[PDB]
Amino acid sequence: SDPSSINGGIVVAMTGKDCVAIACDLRLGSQSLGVSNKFEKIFHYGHVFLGITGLATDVTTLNEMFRYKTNLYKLKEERAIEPETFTQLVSSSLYERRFGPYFVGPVVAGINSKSGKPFIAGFDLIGCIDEAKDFIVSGTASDQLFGMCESLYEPNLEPEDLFETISQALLNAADRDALSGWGAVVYIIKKDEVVKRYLKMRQD
Amino acid sequence: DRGVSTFSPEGRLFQVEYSLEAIKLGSTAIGIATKEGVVLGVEKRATSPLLESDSIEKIVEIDRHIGCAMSGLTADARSMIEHARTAAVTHNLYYDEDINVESLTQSVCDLALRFGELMSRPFGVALLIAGHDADDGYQLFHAEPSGTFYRYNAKAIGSGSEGAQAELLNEWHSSLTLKEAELLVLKILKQVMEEKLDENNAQLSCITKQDGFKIYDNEKTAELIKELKEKEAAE
Amino acid sequence: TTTLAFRFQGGIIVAVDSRATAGNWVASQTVKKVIEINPFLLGTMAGGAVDCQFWETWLGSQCRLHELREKERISVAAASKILSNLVYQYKGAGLSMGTMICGYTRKEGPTIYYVDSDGTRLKGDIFCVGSGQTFAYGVLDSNYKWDLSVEDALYLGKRSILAAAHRDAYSGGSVNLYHVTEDGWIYHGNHDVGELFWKVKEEEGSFNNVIG
Amino acid sequence: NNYDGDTVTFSPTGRLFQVEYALEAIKQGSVTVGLRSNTHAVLVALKRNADELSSYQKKIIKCDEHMGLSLAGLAPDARVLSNYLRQQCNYSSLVFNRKLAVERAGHLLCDKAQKNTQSYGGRPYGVGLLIIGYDKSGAHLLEFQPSGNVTELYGTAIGARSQGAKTYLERTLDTFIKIDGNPDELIKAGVEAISQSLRDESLTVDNLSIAIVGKDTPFTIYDGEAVAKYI
Amino acid sequence: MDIILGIRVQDSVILASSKAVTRGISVLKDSDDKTRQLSPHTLMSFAGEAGDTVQFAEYIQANIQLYSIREDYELSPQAVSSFVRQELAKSIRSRRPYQVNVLIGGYDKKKNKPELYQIDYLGTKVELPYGAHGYSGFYTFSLLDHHYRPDMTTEEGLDLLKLCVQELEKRMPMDFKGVIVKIVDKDGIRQVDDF
Amino acid sequence: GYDRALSIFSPDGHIFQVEYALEAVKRGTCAVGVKGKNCVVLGCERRSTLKLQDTRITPSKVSKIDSHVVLSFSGLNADSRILIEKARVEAQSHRLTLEDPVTVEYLTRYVAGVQQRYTQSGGVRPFGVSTLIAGFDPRDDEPKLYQTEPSGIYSSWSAQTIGRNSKTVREFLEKNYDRKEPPATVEECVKLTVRSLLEVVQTGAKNIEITVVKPDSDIVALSSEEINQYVTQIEQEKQE
Amino acid sequence: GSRRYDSRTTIFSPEGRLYQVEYALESISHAGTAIGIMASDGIVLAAERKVTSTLLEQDTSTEKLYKLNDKIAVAVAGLTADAEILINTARIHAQNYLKTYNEDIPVEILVRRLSDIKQGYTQHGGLRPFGVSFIYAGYDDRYGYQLYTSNPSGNYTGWKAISVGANTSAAQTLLQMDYKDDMKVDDAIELALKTLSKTTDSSALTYDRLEFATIRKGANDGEVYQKIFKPQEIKDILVKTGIT
Amino acid sequence: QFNPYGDNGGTILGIAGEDFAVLAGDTRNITDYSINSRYEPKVFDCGDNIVMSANGFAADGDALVKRFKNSVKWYHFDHNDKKLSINSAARNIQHLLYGKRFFPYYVHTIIAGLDEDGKGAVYSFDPVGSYEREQCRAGGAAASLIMPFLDNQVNFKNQYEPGTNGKVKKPLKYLSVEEVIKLVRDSFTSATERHIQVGDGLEILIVTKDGVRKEFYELKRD
Amino acid sequence: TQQPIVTGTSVISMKYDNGVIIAADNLGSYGSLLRFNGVERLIPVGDNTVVGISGDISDMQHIERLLKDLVTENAYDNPLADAEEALEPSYIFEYLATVMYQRRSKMNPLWNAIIVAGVQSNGDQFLRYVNLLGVTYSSPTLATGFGAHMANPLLRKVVDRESDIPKTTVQVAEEAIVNAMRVLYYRDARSSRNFSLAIIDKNTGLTFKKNLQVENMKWDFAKDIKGYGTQKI
Ligand SMILES: [Mg+2]
Ligand SMILES: [Mg+2]
């Protein structure tokens, strides 16, 4: 019934020293029934990364929409969109559906190509921006993620240390949520290299 | 330039008067009304011998009790026929009965003056609407692009109209049989046609109370043409 | 209501009851549940009476416009789909319709389409619709063969309505029979269920439970 | 000349040529006569045929049980205006349970024709109408021009050669106004009036069209052998 | 309608769809084909609310056939599935949404690969080795999870499909009157007339 | 919106915009249609003023409306695309509602109706296009060939040509086409179609396109070499 | 009324020509020459900027060559402002197609769409046509490398090599003379620049008067790269080919 | 919440004879347990020898009758004063009713007159437009009290010929206008006794080839 | 769809030999609060018609303006506005009846019950009812709300059928109306003592009486009534 918890899933994003990390589980379900273990919830437009939790049809639709919009942005601006700008675009796009919204929990992550500053941001389904320094969480195990991140996180972690923190935050949160899990992916993002790691986890 | 719905100094609509000139260039169509039925006949006028003449459709069914013949820019008649058929069927749906021939004709003629700056110009085609109803019996109407329609005992429209009408003036009487009318249409068509009249370049049709509207086979018309030739050679 | 229609060697048999009720009150025993769309096409009435009446006489108008434009008899497939597409536009508004569009053409042969106010359109050999449909189905299924004669097929349709008329409280009055051929439908009379029941009981030996 | 291309253009002398050209179409139309007494009002119309095979164009149209008109000019325009009158008569009856006053019917026709003379794209109506009726203030006769001018009269005539009938009615004014409670004599005066507009042709059985409305007489049209009595 | 299954094997896609059509208390038909050929190498099966299912399927069919004529070219299964998803995603926020779930089985002639796409009425698309809609997956997925291999032959896929249908016939309360099975491969679409 | 009446009658009863649309057809490359006993062939001229053309991707003159019907044209190329698109949409719409593909006559009547509509609608000009529509009705083996023109009139033809120098090729067809015995085979029909174009074309190289349509949705376009063999055989018989 | 002032942009001449289309083509003939040459391993787009100034900021300037998507580019000849209206529409169509089918739009489908828009302005609306001719250079996995052109009539055609704008007659003859089917990109680059150098109305062809672009599969493995040449890069290729 | 519908009671009865037809209706108009009027005409002469009554919610009843009378008037204008046949009127009324399919005229309509062969005709409509020619039809409040009586006394249902004992039915002999009026009066007298909404007065409109005639009779006023 | 806020109670009326009488109290209630005591609910139209209105007062004021506007409009281009082409009761009623039914059909009714009383041009008595549903009916006596239940029975004892109208004088008719208003004051909890009465006679014309009061009331017997059963003191 509740659109934001039919399909399930989670996204988490964290900042480190000269790097950001964004991660998600791979589950898509129909309530109790597990349907897919390959449903990735993180997308990227140039160097800007977008995670989206919630109703899966809207996740897909919004990805296609932001690909559409960032492609036109690039053709006109003659440059790739930045995380700060994209965050405002996500916010504007969600709020234009104020009284018929997409049932999603987006999370932006990336490094500004000019300043080199790590950036993350989160939104509610309607567009309100949560620009946290430390971390952003989203999905059906957001409470669990808040608990994991709050205790595990410390500032200025190196890329390979941040990987361990965000991975352990996601995994243990997902294992306390029926509608999350079935695999996981972690992106480690530096100014000019991005590493993508699939995690091994319990498949129940 | 000038308005499409402009009046001339004589009190006529330029566009309506000009559309009447287009109808004069059209192929001949003749209608004759009798107490045994109404006969409709047309000149097909194929532009080339490779054109399959049976595909020339200048006589058309509107309902079982109403037929229609056309002359002029025949492409313009298609929407008029569509409207007529719709009007006939719609009235049957609303009233569980056949529609009067006059009422059908009036419905078609209401489209005529719906032009301005609605469609951009008047229709370039005249219609002979023939039919039968219980109230006024066998009827023949002439529907113009002016929106005016006259009832006729007999009427010719198209390029050979004034010559044919003068011939219809002498020949028509109130006691004509259906067979006599059929030959009379064929006689007058043959007179005004450029090419020699046969079953392939001319078409006949009729509307009777019993059988309704019927377009004549080329075999049926061919016999009537042969019957005509013999009776003219008979004196 | 009980309406049926089935395909067979000799074409289509259409059979319907005649009862109309408003709650427990029997409003009419002389209702016509076969709509004569045109001389070649028939439709059955179930669910909403007016919805079936109105839109199937409308369908007859659309079929007439088709054959005027195309100079050819409309197919049963095309006729049924005009009706189904129409009711589908109204879906949700509250139309009530369960009908069999029946016809016999050259290209198709004898054809029956079940059309529904939910937008359902099903081609089939035997259909039964109404409150007494289950009773009619029983007699049909156990006695139906493709190689039935026109006489026996007509009786089977009559007997199946009688079965429903007896058991179903909201079916009865009289039985209307039609036989659909390629050259058009043929009406096979109105048969009072009261008189038919006793006649069938005696001649057939059925309904031993009932005292006569 | 340069100011007759459309209805929206005044001439230098303040004339509207398109309206005047529409007025000219009435003069080309067949003659029709209107006259009334205190009890009845009568329309007499000379119908025109295309040729000997053709029917005679109908000139008179019924608008309500107590009102109707005769036309001269473009017949389709009369059909549009008569249809409009039928609706206005009908609106009055349905909404107010009230028969539409003949004078008010004239006001409505005036205003409808006026809008066609002041706007671009359209054209004036190409027909003149003679409206008769019997309402709460007795018998009435109106003359409608497509310029918008509507005039209440004892008698009048419009169409080709209408001046002859109009002069006759101007002489007979004191006689025919007094024809009360006698429909046949009032029609006779109308038939004698329209006869003054005839040349070469005479009034035959399928040529003549007569209509009448009065105190205890619904608007009824007489054609065919019903008018042989008056020939 | 009720049960629709799909399985992608080595060189083909197999779609199985129930034959029953129930309208309330009665089973009106036991030979209904719940599928439409969108293009020579693309088949779509469907299940959902009455009327909407066929209306939607035929609408998609017409659109793909229109594209095929315009471009003189067959769209890839992926392209067709994306088009279908968008239509359903458009539909879910409409005045009256299409209540239709579909499986799209296609053979990509460019890549020489079979492809099975599962799309629900919300516009939720997933590419799968095997899929289902409604309650069908609840009975069959444990068997498919166990036996399925990506290098299966068409004959092995049909045997695994029979086992799925047998389990459905045993544990489902509803009588779905068996299934019509169709195979989509490089040569096109064909029906297995004995199952 | 723009509502101007562009197509209007003149004092002599002519609609010049419709007649000037025919002059655009007269300028267009020649198209020819010939129906045999069990086939129809559509021949089309390609003007050789344009070389360095990419013939793979360049819009072909003959277009499939459905799997069983084809449409060729003479006149404005851009205008023809609008008629082709509308026709293709109507073909699918007909299949969807009537559950049967369009007859060739029906499809012709639709296209001709669209053309007619543009001759008395405000703010539009007529199509500068005449079409040849050919094919076979569903489950029918009788060949069909129709012609349409800007005015909106249409008719059936045993054989017909449209475009530039169509007067000449019509002259040829009128003396060479026998109604009592039409081209019995595909070869005879194609040969007569190529022969008729050779009266006008210039060189028989890449200037002639041929498309053969047969019953039951059997449509194929001949290649350069296949057509070149007809061109060779025709002139070798002519040297006598 | 208003009729008096209507030019009637969508009518036939007595000869059956569209006045405004013909006059728009006359306008385009005075625009800077644009050339497209298709090779087996890529496409070249070369175009001449019209009588420039020394104070024009060239490195940020764009009047001739525009990007529609990652696979398709266009060379413009005519009114730049009119072209940008159409270019933005084309960019949107490409994205609509990509959103719908999850595949990059085939070149011809995009070209047909823009050409149909141009056509509409000649048949209805009473507006003047777009005074623009495009050369479309693009790639897709069906037909590979493709060159098209469209003009204000809405008519489009496919080409191996083609010119638009000024001196097309002279340019097309020179291309027809030196073009061959087995030609490569580096050879086509040379042909394009040589053709412009001879047909130009300027005294000499220099880097500041040119815009240049290539669509190559010369991208790392099976994929396509668009290269809009920078002022310094145009200067280098002019020296390499031996024109300056 | 606003309820756009109401119940004005009343009962109507249409009977088709061999060469005549009657349409009767009580003249009482009510809401709940109150009498609005003891004489409020319910059956109307609509012209062209057609009589009509739309029983149930009186506002919709009056609206429908008004629109049908209007339709008769415009039928004359549009079709050269042609007489609207009873069958054509019936089809026209269907479309008037079905026009408001999703916000219906809350009435049970009956019309009566003569068909084109001069025989007696009665047509019966439901609120949404389904209609049908009938020999006998009571409508309104006391319809359930009247129809069974008419089945028995007009159509001779369940009546057999003495001596045969169920083997031979009573023959369906034609009833005169005087015989029908007796059955109408007794139907309404009985309905008045046992139904609270029926009473005050009975108005009968009789249609023949000669025209429309009216008859009025008193009913009990309690 | 709304709910009535400020409301007016019964309007009562009857025919007599030469015309009609109509009456209504001067109260505008606000639920159980007797808020406004000077509300005129009889609105004359010309010299031949009086429209009495009960129910929602804001809708009454709207209707009052429609009738005022109707008189203005009738006078336009009408030389006989004060003679042959003056507004009749039947015209005024049919107009209101049309409006009431249209408004109920848009599911936005004028929340009223209306009685149009008047005398026609030919001297005929006009008395007809219309309400928020567009329901209309005529009778020798008509009353709205509580009047229907309590006034009609009393007025029907004077004019029980059509034949009793010529036998009923204006004095007898007015007496019955005034007595009915007293009964309504005894028994209707939403009524007031102050009322208006209008007589429309074919001879003497329109007589409009304001500031009338219910008098000759019986209350003295109340002193003897004690307790609710057993109580004696
Ligand atoms: Mg689990
Ligand atoms: Mg009682």
Domains defined for chain A, CATH in brackets: 1-204 (3.60.20.10)
Interchain CB distance below 8 Å, F99 and C77: yes
- Here the contacts of E133-138 (C-beta below 8 Å, separation 24 or greater) are E133/E4, E133/E47, E133/E101, E133/E102, E133/E103, E134/E2, E134/E3, E134/E4, E134/E47, E134/E101, E135/E3, E135/E172, E136/E2, E136/E3, E136/E4, E136/E5, E136/E168, E137/A33, E137/A35, E138/A33
Distance CA(C141)–CA(D123), nearest Å, equals 72
Distance CA(D189)–CA(D180), nearest Å, equals 13
Chains F and A touch (3+ CB pairs under 8 A): no
Interchain CB distance below 8 Å, C61 and B89: yes
Which residues crowd ion ligand 1, with CB under 5 Å? A 204
Contacts of B4 in chain F (CB under 8 A): 5, 8
Interchain CB distance below 8 Å, F81 and G6: no
Q: Which chains touch F (3 or more CB pairs under 8 A)?
A: B, C, E, G
Q: What's phi and psi for B114, nearest 5 deg?
A: -80, 60
CATH of G1-244, one of 3.40.50.720, 3.90.180.10, 3.60.20.10, 3.30.420.40: 3.60.20.10
Distance CA(A149)–CA(I88), nearest Å, equals 85
**Closest chain C residue by Cα to residue H168:** C195
Buried-state track G82-111, b at ≥16 Cβ within 10 A, e below 16 = bbeebbeebbebbbebbbbbbebbbbbebb
CA quadruple F89, F93, F96, F102: dihedral, nearest 10: -90
CB pairs under 8 A between B and D: 85
- Ligand closest to H26 (CA) is 2
Domains defined for chain F, CATH in brackets: 1-240 (3.60.20.10)
Residue B79 touches partner C, C-beta closer than 8 Å: no
Q: Which chains touch C (3 or more CB pairs under 8 A)?
A: B, E, F, H
CATH of the domain at E193: 3.60.20.10
In sequence order, the 6+-apart residues with CB closer than 8 A to the CB of B38 are B31, B32, B67, B130, B131, B132, B138, B139, B140, B206, B207
**Closest chain D residue by Cα to residue G2:** D120
**Closest chain C residue by Cα to residue E25:** C134
Domains defined for chain D, CATH in brackets: 1-231 (3.60.20.10)
**Closest chain G residue by Cα to residue E74:** G142
Strand order in the sheet with I11-16: I141-143, I11-16, I19-25, I194-201, I205-213
CA quadruple B135, B136, B139, B143: dihedral, nearest 10: -80
The answer to whether I184 and I2 are in contact (CB under 8 A) is: no
The minimum CA-CA distance between F213 and chain B, rounded to whole Å, is 20
**Ligand 1 mean position, distance from CA A152 (Å):** 26
**Ligand 1 mean position, distance from CA A204 (Å):** 4
Residue of G98, G99, G100 for testing the chain E interface, max E β-carbons within 10 Å? G100
Q: How far apart are the first and last CA of chain H?
A: 33
Count of Cβ atoms closer than 10 Å to residue F179 Cβ: 10
**The two three-digit tokens of residue D27, written as one number:** 């003069």
**Partners of I125 in the β-ladder:** I119
Greatest C-alpha distance within chain E = 48
Q: Find the domain containing C205 and state its range.
A: 1-212
CATH of the domain at C4: 3.60.20.10
Residue E96 touches partner C, C-beta closer than 8 Å: yes
Interchain CB distance below 8 Å, H126 and C49: yes
The answer to whether F144 and F116 are in contact (CB under 8 A) is: no
Domains defined for chain H, CATH in brackets: 1-222 (3.60.20.10)
Phi-psi region of I205 (alpha: psi -120 to 50; beta: other; left: phi over 0): left
Domain count for chain C, please give it.
1
Cβ-based burial of E95 (10 A; exposed 0-12, middle 13-18, buried ≥19)? exposed
Distances (CA, A) of H217 to F153, H139, H200: 70, 19, 9
- Ligand closest to A177 (CA) is 1
**The two three-digit tokens of residue A201, written as one number:** 């986890």
- Ligand closest to A174 (CA) is 1
Distance CA(C97)–CA(C91), nearest Å, equals 11
CA quadruple H31, H34, H39, H40: dihedral, nearest 10: -20
The answer to whether H205 and H52 are in contact (CB under 8 A) is: no
Contacts of I101 in chain H (CB under 8 A): 59, 63
Q: Find the domain containing E21 and state its range.
A: 1-195
Distance CA(D172)–CA(D165), nearest Å, equals 10
Q: Is C46 assigned to a binding site?
A: no
**The two three-digit tokens of residue A22, written as one number:** 């964004």
The answer to whether C102 and C184 are in contact (CB under 8 A) is: no
Catalytic residue, candidates I1, I49, I168, I207: I1
Residues on D contacting H at a C-beta cutoff of 8 Å: 62, 86, 90, 94
Give kind and range of the element (H or E) at residue C123: strand C121-124
Distance CA(G8)–CA(G123), nearest Å, equals 11
Distance CA(E157)–CA(E5), nearest Å, equals 12
The answer to whether B61 and B162 are in contact (CB under 8 A) is: no
Residue E82 touches partner G, C-beta closer than 8 Å: yes
Distance CA(G172)–CA(G167), nearest Å, equals 8
Strand order in the sheet with A42-45: A42-45, A48-54, A104-111, A118-123, A129-130
The minimum CA-CA distance between D54 and chain B, rounded to whole Å, is 4
The answer to whether F134 and F43 are in contact (CB under 8 A) is: no
Q: How far apart are the first and last CA of chain C?
A: 25
**Partners of F135 in the β-ladder:** F69, F144
**Partners of E148 in the β-ladder:** none
Pick from H218, H217, H214: nearest CA to H44: H214
**Closest chain C residue by Cα to residue B94:** C58
What is the rounded radius of gyration, in angstroms, for the C-alpha atoms of chain H?
A: 18
The minimum CA-CA distance between H151 and chain B, rounded to whole Å, is 29
**Ligand 2 mean position, distance from CA H210 (Å):** 34
CA quadruple I22, I25, I27, I32: dihedral positive or negative?
negative
Distance CA(I155)–CA(C174), nearest Å, equals 54
Q: Find the domain containing I141 and state its range.
A: 1-233
**Ligand 1 mean position, distance from CA E174 (Å):** 27
Residue C32 touches partner H, C-beta closer than 8 Å: yes
Q: Which chains touch A (3 or more CB pairs under 8 A)?
A: E, G
Residues on B contacting H at a C-beta cutoff of 8 Å: 93-97, 99-100, 102-103, 135-136
CA quadruple C137, C141, C143, C148: dihedral positive or negative?
positive
Give kind and range of the element (H or E) at residue H114: strand H107-114
**Closest chain B residue by Cα to residue H87:** B96
Distance CA(C59)–CA(C79), nearest Å, equals 7
Domains defined for chain B, CATH in brackets: 1-235 (3.60.20.10)
- Ligand closest to H198 (CA) is 2
Angle, helices I146-156/I170-187, rounded to nearest 10 degrees: 140
Phi-psi region of A9 (alpha: psi -120 to 50; beta: other; left: phi over 0): left
DSSP state of A128: -
Distance CA(A118)–CA(A21), nearest Å, equals 10
CA quadruple C144, C146, C147, C152: dihedral, nearest 10: 40
Residue C1 annotated in active site: yes
Residue C70 touches partner E, C-beta closer than 8 Å: no
The answer to whether D137 and I79 are in contact (CB under 8 A) is: no
Experimentally, how was this structure solved? X-ray
Distance CA(B111)–CA(B120), nearest Å, equals 12
CA quadruple G130, G133, G137, G141: dihedral positive or negative?
positive
Chains H and F touch (3+ CB pairs under 8 A): no
What's the CA angle centered on F162, arms F161 and F166, to 5 degrees? 75
Distance CA(H7)–CA(H196), nearest Å, equals 14
